[PDB]
Design an enzyme around this catalytic site. Structure first.
Site, PDB file in Angstrom:
ATOM      1  CB  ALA A 248      39.894 -36.998  11.510  1.00 59.78           C
ATOM      2  CB  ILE A 249      45.984 -37.695  11.650  1.00 61.54           C
ATOM      3  CG1 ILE A 249      45.668 -38.035  10.624  1.00 61.54           C
ATOM      4  CG2 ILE A 249      47.733 -38.677  12.229  1.00 61.54           C
ATOM      5  CD1 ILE A 249      45.365 -39.727  10.104  1.00 61.54           C
TER       6      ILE A 249
ATOM      7  CE1 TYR B 170      44.025 -30.194  13.679  1.00 58.84           C
ATOM      8  CE2 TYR B 170      45.288 -31.174  15.263  1.00 58.84           C
ATOM      9  CZ  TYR B 170      44.664 -29.760  13.789  1.00 58.84           C
ATOM     10  OH  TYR B 170      45.685 -28.734  14.196  1.00 58.84           O
TER      11      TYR B 170
ATOM     12  CG  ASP C 155      41.884 -28.120   5.973  1.00 60.77           C
ATOM     13  OD1 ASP C 155      42.878 -28.976   5.632  1.00 60.77           O
ATOM     14  OD2 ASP C 155      42.471 -27.204   6.723  1.00 60.77           O
TER      15      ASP C 155
ATOM     16  CG  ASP D 193      40.666 -27.638  11.353  1.00 58.66           C
ATOM     17  OD1 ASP D 193      40.915 -27.611  10.239  1.00 58.66           O
ATOM     18  OD2 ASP D 193      41.574 -26.761  11.870  1.00 58.66           O
TER      19      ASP D 193
ATOM     20  CG  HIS E 242      43.675 -17.284   2.874  1.00 58.63           C
ATOM     21  ND1 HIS E 242      44.494 -18.922   3.048  1.00 58.63           N
ATOM     22  CD2 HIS E 242      43.842 -17.718   3.760  1.00 58.63           C
ATOM     23  CE1 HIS E 242      44.806 -18.721   4.428  1.00 58.63           C
ATOM     24  NE2 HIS E 242      43.754 -17.453   4.586  1.00 58.63           N
TER      25      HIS E 242
ATOM     26  CB  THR F 298      52.164 -16.122   1.970  1.00 59.24           C
ATOM     27  OG1 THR F 298      50.692 -17.472   1.950  1.00 59.24           O
ATOM     28  CG2 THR F 298      51.773 -14.524   2.745  1.00 59.24           C
TER      29      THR F 298
ATOM     30  CD  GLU G 172      47.110 -21.920   2.116  1.00 62.51           C
ATOM     31  OE1 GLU G 172      47.896 -21.706   2.853  1.00 62.51           O
ATOM     32  OE2 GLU G 172      46.606 -22.586   2.441  1.00 62.51           O
TER      33      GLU G 172
END
Ligand SMILES: O=c1ccn([C@@H]2O[C@H](COP(=O)(O)OP(=O)(O)O)[C@@H](O)[C@H]2O)c(=O)[nH]1
Ligand SMILES: OC[C@H]1O[C@@H](O)[C@H](O)[C@@H](O)[C@H]1O
Ligand SMILES: [Mn+2]
Length: 275
Positions: free
Chosen positions: A61-62, A65, A140, A142, A162, A174, A232
């Site tokens: 959490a930078i 965030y 993550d 968020d 995903h 991708t 990723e």
């Protein structure tokens, strides 16, 4: 040594009746793909509590965030590995902005200050994790937990499908497509597209993965190339060449605003927070 399970009373599995007919529940290298209806959590809880399992959860959490930590930790308390030992490791450039969240018994939080991709290097804390937890889970910030995320995910190495690509053919994935990057995957390779927002495993296998992805990212940097989806793209190259021993279904990483609530998802367990 694994001691005996106690007597338990539960529904008999019947081999001529599948738990789920609508989805693939085992990969072609015989790793379980974890969907609701595939596991009896009371059996799994007994197995992992008899080993006194401790699960570490890493979150970064930078900068801005840090605002996501309150809901992330409060909902983790309601849903993540409840009844098991949990150690949260919050990596942040603002230790004072970490919210004071009340934790259930057997759960702890450590604030690790870092400088404001680099999650892989920072994860690969190596000695601390080996001494303190049995599994690491790397997610993550968020995000919020909306439903159970427990010991059914634990295994030596896992990735998570995903949510934009679970119905896609591999040529649509991708992946990094330039042969000049260490993350390159050709169009006729690939099992799944995994999301960098939720992966984990035993501390040994998560240190292997994050060391190999950090080494491959340094090679790319030396060669002046940055993979299309950053760490990723490297996590996907790693998991193509080192198959995960479980794969989490998109129950475990969803975005209801973007993708709604399809019938194939019986539970939405860990979801994106609007940003
Ligand atoms: O300024 C930032 C940018 C990213 N992150 C961390 O890196 C993760 C991956 O970034 P992000 O969630 O922005 O990627 P996205 O899911 O939007 O593609 C975030 O969840 C945070 O844990 C952060 O802490 N501060
Ligand atoms: O195509 C890959 C990308 O897909 C997006 O939907 C996601 O927001 C990105 O973080 C990355 O995973
Ligand atoms: Mn995110």
């Amino acid at each position: 040594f694994m001691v005996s399970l106690p007597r338990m009373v539960y529904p008999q599995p019947k081999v001529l009746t599948p738990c789920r007919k609508d989805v693939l529940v085992v990969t072609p290298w015989l790793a379980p793909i974890v969907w609701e209806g595939t596991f009896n959590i009371d059996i799994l809880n007994e197995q992992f509590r008899l080993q006194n399992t401790t699960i570490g959860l890493t979150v970064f959490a930078i900068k801005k965030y840090v605002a996501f930590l309150k809901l992330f930790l409060e909902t983790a308390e309601k849903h993540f590995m409840v009844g098991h030992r949990v150690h949260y490791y919050v990596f942040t450039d603002q230790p004072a902005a970490v919210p004071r969240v009340t934790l259930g018994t057997g759960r702890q939080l450590s604030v690790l200050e870092v400088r404001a991709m680099r999650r892989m290097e920072m994860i690969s804390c190596e000695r601390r994790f080996l001494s303190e937890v049995d599994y690491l889970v790397c997610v993550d910030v968020d995000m919020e937990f909306r439903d159970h995320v427990g010991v059914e995910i634990l295994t030596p190495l896992f990735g998570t499908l995903h949510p934009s690509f679970y119905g896609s053919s591999r040529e649509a994935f991708t992946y990094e497509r330039r042969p000049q990057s260490q993350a390159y995957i050709p169009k006729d390779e690939g099992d799944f597209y995994y999301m960098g927002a939720f992966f984990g495993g035993s501390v040994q296998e998560v240190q292997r993965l994050t060391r190999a992805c950090h080494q491959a990212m340094m090679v790319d940097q030396a060669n002046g190339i940055e993979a299309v989806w950053h760490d990723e793209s490297h996590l996907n190259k790693y998991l193509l060449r080192h198959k995960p021993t479980k794969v989490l279904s998109p129950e475990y990483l969803w975005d209801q605003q973007l993708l709604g609530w399809p019938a194939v998802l019986r539970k939405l367990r860990f979801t994106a927070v609007p940003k």
